[PDB]
Amino acid sequence: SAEDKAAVERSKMIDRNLREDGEKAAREVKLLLLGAGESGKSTIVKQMKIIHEAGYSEEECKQYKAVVYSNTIQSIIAIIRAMGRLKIDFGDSARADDARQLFVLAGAAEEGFMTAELAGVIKRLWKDSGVQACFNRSREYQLNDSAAYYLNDLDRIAQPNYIPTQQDVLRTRVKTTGIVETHFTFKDLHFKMFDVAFEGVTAIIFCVALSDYDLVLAEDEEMNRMHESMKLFDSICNNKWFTDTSIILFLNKKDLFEEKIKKSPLTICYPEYAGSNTYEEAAAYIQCQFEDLNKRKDTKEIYTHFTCATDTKNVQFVFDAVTDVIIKNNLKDCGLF
């Protein structure tokens, strides 16, 4: 049994015996978190802390509430502004005043905030048929993936005394810069996890936003996002430094993808795609497109997982499976400290 096989495997080790206090030494695992912007790397970092360490306590969550406000405000403003650039009128003409009031209020504030007035303005905008029609064309502009999440719970978020939930925090988009290092312990392995905006890397976890298949890059409107992370995977996966590195592929945002794929065709990303436009076929196709980039197949297996990184239980399940792979394949290259 897959987990037993890992337990057996680790029990074959004898290097702890070479240390005076071998049995309480720390077995160290260096893990690199890679992927395009907004692919989910920071979200996975949060999930490690939630799952393996303290968590995100309530006072920690309160620190994020203006971030939630800011995310919500950015989201609605992006949709309203797109309406203009895409020539979508408001379903109810009275909403043009709310749109203005949105800019008046955001225009005079210093950071993310929420008042009854502003909640009222945004909830009326979000309920409008025209705004909804613009929302449903978001692949044509740039919009936070959490737009719907926050805006549908606007009422809860608007409450005075609102206290951000874990899911609220997980759903935030926080501007990360440079390299973030996080430490946690799981199955007696001491993970050092690096999120890059390396030598002796035990494992790489490469994140892909599946839901990007119909989106265009932020910098350049004429540049398919999925293709960019492919070009990046290619480079990473076949990199000489990583031959003995377990390469794990998180095909992430599977929940957004499952919703997109119904009404938006894969052919946008891969024009040659000739399979049915269903979750099953299009997901598989994407997986095959990436895994096929592995130029040294005979001697390098890629471990692919379909994840929803904001879903704590899914990440725990997945990271558990990823950990048995490291324990079965890389343990001999992991030092004791």
Q: CA nearest 99: which of 71, 113, 118? A: 118
Judge whether 15 and 149 are in contact, CB under 8 Å.
no
Q: CA nearest 134: which of 69, 84, 95? A: 84
Q: Considering only residues 173, 187, 190, 328, which one is a binding residue for ligand GDP as defined by CB under 6 A? A: 173
Does residue 83 bind Cl ion (CB under 5 A)?
Answer: yes
Number of other residues whose CB lies within 10 A of the CB of residue 326: 22
Considering only residues 177-206, where is the footprint of ligand GDP by CB under 6 A?
none
Tell me the window of 9-17, 84-92, 103-111, 215-223 that interacts with Cl ion (CB under 5 A). Answer: 84-92
120: buried, middle or exposed (CB in 10 Å: 19+, 13-18, 0-12)? Answer: middle
Q: Which does 252 bind (CB under 5 to 8 A by kind): ligand GDP, Cl ion, none?
A: ligand GDP
Rounded distance between C-alpha atoms, residue 72 and residue 81, angstroms: 14
- The closest residue (CB) to ligand GDP is 42
Find all residues with CB under 8 Å of 165, minimum gap 6, and list them.
61
Tell me the window of 10-18, 125-133, 252-260, 317-325 that interacts with ligand GDP (CB under 6 A). Answer: 252-260
- Residues just before a chain gap in the chain (C–N exceeding 2.5 Å) are 197
Does residue 226 bind ligand GDP (CB under 6 A)?
Answer: no
Question: In angstroms, what is the minimal distance from the CB of 148 to ligand GDP?
Answer: 9
Considering only residues 277-336, where is the footprint of ligand GDP by CB under 6 A?
308-310
Nearer to Cl ion, 131 or 203 (CB): 131
Considering only residues 38-57, where is the footprint of Cl ion by CB under 5 A?
none
Q: Which residues bind ligand GDP (CB under 6 A)?
A: 35, 37-43, 145-146, 170-173, 176, 252-253, 255-256, 308-310
Q: Which residues bind Cl ion (CB under 5 A)?
A: 83-84
